[PDB]
């Protein structure tokens, strides 16, 4: 509901007067204290989140009007105030009560609070000080109780709600750093009636882009039907007083011989724009190579403008879009629509912006109609995605030729006439953010102070821009290459272009022919490129030709190829090389900005000309912080959703930890995380709205959600690399392997937890292997690490690597290591190393490939130039002696861990308990005799067989019992059902719950053999003695 607005200097918690009509027809009569919510509409891409207030009846207020304290928004009503808001009285008067509220207080009041004797006395003192009441007063967040004294630091449960001042905890924090001095209630920076006396001629003031579009409803005055938004300007009230007219008719802006007519309105008070500056939309700003400061003057003759609109001359500005075949039709239609307005004004040298939708290029909505054909409301469904300009040159003068400075265009007299293509420079990003104004998909705003590589590119391009007045052909090609996809190359290029104001050509791999290129593909490619470029370059100064994914077109010679097929490759290479340099000297300032995903495959004939190659690393910790700060920003989330409830993040989030916890992820991954978080938050919001609980007026992202969304993103990545779905073993099952447990912990996790002491290039001993008798945990430990440590887990399925041909095993090994090296925190599990790394050069062997492969292992595993040692290697075998020594060395496999038979009743009971853990054990009997009765030749795996056998016996008992029950039932009835039918017709869940009684154990233990003989065990004992005894 829309309510008229006015402000007062009352207290923050003073009741808000509301008109009788609303209080009666909508206000709840049963409520002792009525509460409503207000939204302030402000110049931005969305409405503000609602703020709650307490209201009371007031007969003095006119129809649908409200009065509120201006101090609730940190200002005073000295300047013109806003005249309306959106309001709704809460149905059922539902409001939440905050359990705790955090306040920041000044030193003097905190000293007074200690001086105050008692807790209750202090509570009453605060009651009187800031009008805070139990279950009556409602608090908000980011608000100030009084200028420079106290501020609401935080509110945990909700941004606003009631306070149980009797019990709600009040976290009072002393302002030890005097931050509260920064608080400022929209106060004036002093004020003078005449800072300069009699300065009626002109005033000099700053010009900067208006940050967002303007909606007519927010305008204080009442302009006419048409010809308003194209010449708007907004300023502070006092600036109007310095001009001697409040929101005067027309103003003029004059510098460098360019004079334009503008209309100046008052900037409305609540907005937080800067002081003493002109805020204008891009339409007027574009006309200038504007200086930071600019002078303005009165122009009364503007009210007497002349409609001399006959035979106007229009021109399409140079640009990438203007030269496209399909767009041209919609461009024409939208230009005719723009000039269809009755009273638009215009003057020579003006740039007129024209927005339109990119994807409506083919949707001819309807033909022209005799009557009742209009676009106004029909367009509301779609919002624009691309922008162009038009450059205006001349117009008729007629008998009114005495003046030609400014004129109107009338559809009843104006006709569409155009000349050839002109040229002019774009607008540098530093001066006006056009995307921001038109809500486009904003290019990421890099910050050169932080990102290294972008500075190089921008410097090169700006050098080629500045050399225009030096006038030499120094322009140089630039090639971008990256180690991985999705590192924002095209984004940073677009950033540079928009920053330096350089027209950008975006050719890409949407080519015409790439398969069976013999069918004149070379022509279809190069002719297309030449046609696309030649229609833009003669009208762009400077210009940039950007070739995305150039890697997949300028392919290099293949090792194995058809002798004649490669000829086409050579031809395309050479012709591309030629057209590379042709533009260099056929036009001034041309820069060739190519992109490649792997520079190794670019043709040397083409690359050799290249003189600047920037590698674009995956963003390190510092950058991800900024990237998060961007994607989480208000001007990003709130965009493109059109959800009726604005969006925002809760302030309790932490960039610093988030960044560190998102290591290795590329920017696209980051955006994916943000999007998923947004989804989950919206789902939570609608779930709460479905419930009967209190409904927040905003949806708040929470770090508690990001913490798991990042995990899901990482799991997605882990699926990308194709890792197996290892079972979910837990770190607790491992039992009597404490020594090896700690040994593993000291290497896999110790240099990974608190990553500061090990943060160095040292040889961090990424090698480890288990060896010993069969069945003592070697694979289980790996299975546990695979999921309990969050390290990527690669499985080498025994002799997986070995292969048919001579050299494909040597390719498989290298591919495995390369892919693992792609994801730095990764593990390699060489299961049964025997099959892959036999002793080198034995006489009892043939073929020799087993030697080549082990040599390749010795090479790639350790080698030289090794870095980023996070690649662990875990190996296992039944017997190591078949391995070659050259592996049994530090750097590859330092300690050989002998996970021997526990030989110890402590360990035996530990493993028996760990095996029995997760199923019920009847406690009438003690298990220790199971350790005492087994001889120590029994083994971790055969204790597993013992447990499973005992279980199976005890559950066979239950099977027999249920068989007896079903037979009895069949005897009672006509024997009409079997056991299977019994289990769907009837159920006895509690009866089926098998519980093992150790009598079963004492039965089973008599029947199970040891997994190894003394003959084998002595062998492994001797092996250990050799390797460990020393």
């Amino acid at each position: 509901m829309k309510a008229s607005l006015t402000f007062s200097l009352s207290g923050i918690y003073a009741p808000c007067s509301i008109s009788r009509d609303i209080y009666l027809e909508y206000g709840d009569k049963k409520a002792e204290c009525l509460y409503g919510t207000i939204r302030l509409p402000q110049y931005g891409p969305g409405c503000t989140p609602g703020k709650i207030v307490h209201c009371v009846l007031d007969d003095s207020l006119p129809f649908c009007s409200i009065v509120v304290p201006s101090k609730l928004f940190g200002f005073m009503p000295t300047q013109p105030t806003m005249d309306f808001c959106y309001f709704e009285p809460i149905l059922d008067n539902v409001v939440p009560v905050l359990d705790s509220v955090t306040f920041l207080i000044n030193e003097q009041l905190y000293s007074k609070l200690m001086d105050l004797p008692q807790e209750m006395q202090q509570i009453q003192f605060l009651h009187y000080k800031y009008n805070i009441n139990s279950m009556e007063t409602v608090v908000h967040s980011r608000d100030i109780l009084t200028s420079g004294l106290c501020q609401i630091l935080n509110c945990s449960p909700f941004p606003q709600g009631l306070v149980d001042f009797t019990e709600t905890q009040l976290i009072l924090v002393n302002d030890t750093e005097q931050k509260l001095s920064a608080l400022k209630y929209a106060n004036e920076d002093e004020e003078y009636a005449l800072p300069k006396i009699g300065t009626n001629s002109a005033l000099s003031i700053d010009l900067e882009s208006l940050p967002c579009t303007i909606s007519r409803d927010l305008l204080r005055p009442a302009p006419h039907i048409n010809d308003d938004n194209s010449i708007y300007a907004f300023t502070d009230a006092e600036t109007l007083l310095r001009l001697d007219v409040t929101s005067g008719s027309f103003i003029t802006v004059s510098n460098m011989g360019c004079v334009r007519l503008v209309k100046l309105f008052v900037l409305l008070l609540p907005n937080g724009f800067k002081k003493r500056t002109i805020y204008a939309p891009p339409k007027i700003i574009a006309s200038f190579p504007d200086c930071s400061v600019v002078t303005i003057s009165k122009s009364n003759i503007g009210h007497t403008d002349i409609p001399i609109a006959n035979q106007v001359f229009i021109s399409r500005v140079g640009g990438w879009l203007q030269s496209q075949k399909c767009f041209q039709n919609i461009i024409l239609t939208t230009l005719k629509k723009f000039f269809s307005e009755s009273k638009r004004i215009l003057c020579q040298n003006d740039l007129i912006p024209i927005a339109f939708d990119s994807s409506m290029a083919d949707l001819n909505i309807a033909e022209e109609n005799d009557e009742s054909d209009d676009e106004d409301e029909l367009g509301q469904y779609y919002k624009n995605d691309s922008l162009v300009w038009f450059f205006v040159t001349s117009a008729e003068l007629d008998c009114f030729s005495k003046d030609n400075s400014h004129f109107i265009i009338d559809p009843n007299r104006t006709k569409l006439i155009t000349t050839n293509i002109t040229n002019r420079r774009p607008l540098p990003l530093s001066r006006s953010n056009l995307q921001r104004y038109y809500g486009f998909a904003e290019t990421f705003y890099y910050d050169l102070h932080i990102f290294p590589y972008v500075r190089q590119l921008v410097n090169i391009l700006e050098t080629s821009f500045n050399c225009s007045q030096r006038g030499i052909t120094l322009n140089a090609s630039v090639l971008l290459h990256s180690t991985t996809n999705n590192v924002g190359k095209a984004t940073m290029v677009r950033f540079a272009s928009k920053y330096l104001g350089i027209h950008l050509l975006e050719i890409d791999c949407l080519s015409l022919t790439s398969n069976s290129r013999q069918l004149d593909s070379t022509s279809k490619i190069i002719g297309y490129i030449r046609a696309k470029c030649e229609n833009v370059l003669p009208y762009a100064s400077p210009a940039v030709i950007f070739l995305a994914h150039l890697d997949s077109i300028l392919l290099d010679v293949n090792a194995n190829q058809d002798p004649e097929a490669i000829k086409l490759q050579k031809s395309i290479n050479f012709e591309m090389s030629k057209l590379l340099d042709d533009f260099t000297f056929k036009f001034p300032g041309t820069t060739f900005v190519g992109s490649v995903n792997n520079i190794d495959n670019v043709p040397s004939s083409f690359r050799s000309h290249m003189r600047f190659e920037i590698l674009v690393p995956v963003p390190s910790e510092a950058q991800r912080l900024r990237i998060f700060q961007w994607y989480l920003s208000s001007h990003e989330l709130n965009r493109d959703v059109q959800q009726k409830v604005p969006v925002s993040y809760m302030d309790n989030i932490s960039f610093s930890s988030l960044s560190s916890y998102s290591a290795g992820l590329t920017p696209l991954d980051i955006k994916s995380i943000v999007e998923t978080a947004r989804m989950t938050a919206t789902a939570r919001f609608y779930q709460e709205s479905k419930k009967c609980g209190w409904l927040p007026q905003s949806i708040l992202i929470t770090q508690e959600d990001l913490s798991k969304a990042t995990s899901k993103a990482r799991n997605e990545f882990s699926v990308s690399i194709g890792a197996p779905q290892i079972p979910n073993v837990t770190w607790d099952d491992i039992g009597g392997i404490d020594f090896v447990k700690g040994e593993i912990l000291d290497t896999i996790d110790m240099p990974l937890k608190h990553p500061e002491l090990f943060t160095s290039g040292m040889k961090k001993r990424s090698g480890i292997l288990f060896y010993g008798p069969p069945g003592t945990g070697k694979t289980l430990m790996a299975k546990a690490i695979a999921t309990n440590f969050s390290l990527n887990f690669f499985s080498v399925k025994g002799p997986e690597l070995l292969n048919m041909y001579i050299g494909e095993s040597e390719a498989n090994v290298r591919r495995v290591f390369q892919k693992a090296r792609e994801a730095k925190p990764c593990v390699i599990f060489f299961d049964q190393i025997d099959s892959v790394a036999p002793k080198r050069g034995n006489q009892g062997d043939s073929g020799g490939v087993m030697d080549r492969i082990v040599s390749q292992l010795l090479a790639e595993l350790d080698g030289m130039s090794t870095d980023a040692d996070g690649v662990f290697v875990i190996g296992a075998t039944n017997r190591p002696d078949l391995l070659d020594e050259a592996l049994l060395r530090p750097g590859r496999f330092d300690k050989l861990l002998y996970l021997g038979i526990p030989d110890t009743d402590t360990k035996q009971l530990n493993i028996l308990e760990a095996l029995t853990r997760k199923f019920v054990l009847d406690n009438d009997v003690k298990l220790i005799e199971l350790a005492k009765l087994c001889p120590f030749n029994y083994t971790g795996a055969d204790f597993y067989a013992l447990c499973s056998d005992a279980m199976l016996n005890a559950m066979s008992r239950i099977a027999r019992m249920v068989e007896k029950k079903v037979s009895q039932h069949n005897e009672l009835t006509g024997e009409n059902i079997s056991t299977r039918r019994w289990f769907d017709k009837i159920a006895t869940k509690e009866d089926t719950k098998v519980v093992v009684k150790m009598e079963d154990f004492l039965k089973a233990q008599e029947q199970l053999t040891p997994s190894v003989s003394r003959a084998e065990l002595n062998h492994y004992e001797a092996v250990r003695a050799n390797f460990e005894g020393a």
Binding site: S359, I365, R980
Partner: protein, 515 residues
Amino acid sequence: TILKNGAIQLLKKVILRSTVCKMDFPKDNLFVVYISDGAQLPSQKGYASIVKCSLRQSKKSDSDNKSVGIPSKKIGVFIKCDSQIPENHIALSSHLWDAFFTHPMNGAKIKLEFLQMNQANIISGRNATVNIKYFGKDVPTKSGDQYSKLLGGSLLTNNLILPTEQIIIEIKKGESEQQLCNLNEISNESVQWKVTQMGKEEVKDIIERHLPKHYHVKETGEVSRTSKDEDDFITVNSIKKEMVNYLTSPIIATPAIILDGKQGIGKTRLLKELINEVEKDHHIFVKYADCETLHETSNLDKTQKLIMEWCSFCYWYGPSLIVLDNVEALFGKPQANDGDPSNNGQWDNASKLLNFFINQVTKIFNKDNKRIRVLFSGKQKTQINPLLFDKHFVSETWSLRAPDKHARAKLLEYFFSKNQIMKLNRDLQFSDLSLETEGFSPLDLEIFTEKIFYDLQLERDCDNVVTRELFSKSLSAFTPSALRGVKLTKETNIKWGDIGALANAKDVLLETLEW
């Protein structure tokens, strides 16, 4: 503004979007349209039309001159308020669709106009007359009174075609406004009707108008078509619920969803019912592709036009959805490799289409979240081109696992009913009947049921559907799809018995294989 008739006045233009939520009412009305509850109706009556969709008309409108340009047609409509339909949508009842000669598709722009007027409400103000003339091949002559009862009983406007029964409504009384006229407010004594047959020359002249014959494909009637081989769906699994809950969410993470499966395990029928459901209660437009039918896929330039056309339509209409059965034909990585440069393996002929589609979709998704979304399906998740997971197009996934014990009962029940002649004896029951059917799926089950129907029909020498003790025998002769393709064996005929002293082993076997 006052209409050509001085007693009629114009108020305001508005635009809304169509829906098929099936708002109903008695026969008396034909032009009722349901606005949503909200801003009060400024008038009870009005005018309406649709802004026709059209292509770019490139290549001289695809080599067709389209010389007969027509500005569609203007209709009059009742308007009524409803609470169910959303704010921005408009409900267009079953009638008045055939007037536009457009199929009742979910989404389409309506121009709506609110009409005001003073005099003509008076009952029997003047005598009314109209001719209901047969346009095409026609039913023999019928009385005009029952036609008035059936056609425009309450409101109508001249120049209205109706292909539902191949008729034309006309009147040239003279000095008449040729505009909206109310009927149910006028007594029968102050209205007249007549019927004639329209001249062949005029019939063929009018046929030149934009009149796409909706029943060019043979049909038995507007209410019955032979295509409905299957007209039911069984809620065997939650996945239909999942997708309905997630796909229609107010905000979504990524544009795409992927629906994997197994040979004939449900995919196409599941998607077809998801269409049949989502189209009703959520006002989602859907474009069905079935890329297999799409020809000349590898002709990149030609296929790219269809790729663009899909998303163009989907964007022009309201919140929409794109669904591809058997995607891997159109965007599938061959995955077969012997030697190839790594870059061409990354980027072959097929993937180019995928990159174009992804870029084109993201162009919209990044500036209108709820506008366009895609839903792929394919034999296997990972099998699909890695670009999807790399470019982060697909976020959540689901798999149609083979139906569980509890589920198969419903499927078999339904397939048995489908033939409407097969039925079990009193002594036999469904839930037990299924348990033997381990490892099956709906293709297996439906062919197995047909097999049972054959084996009972002739091979048992009985007319009625004897249906026990042949079940097992028939099953013995069957081979489930999965087993059907690999080297299983059942050659050994030696019976369960024939045991010896091997009891001490047979026990163990029972305890480890069967138990």
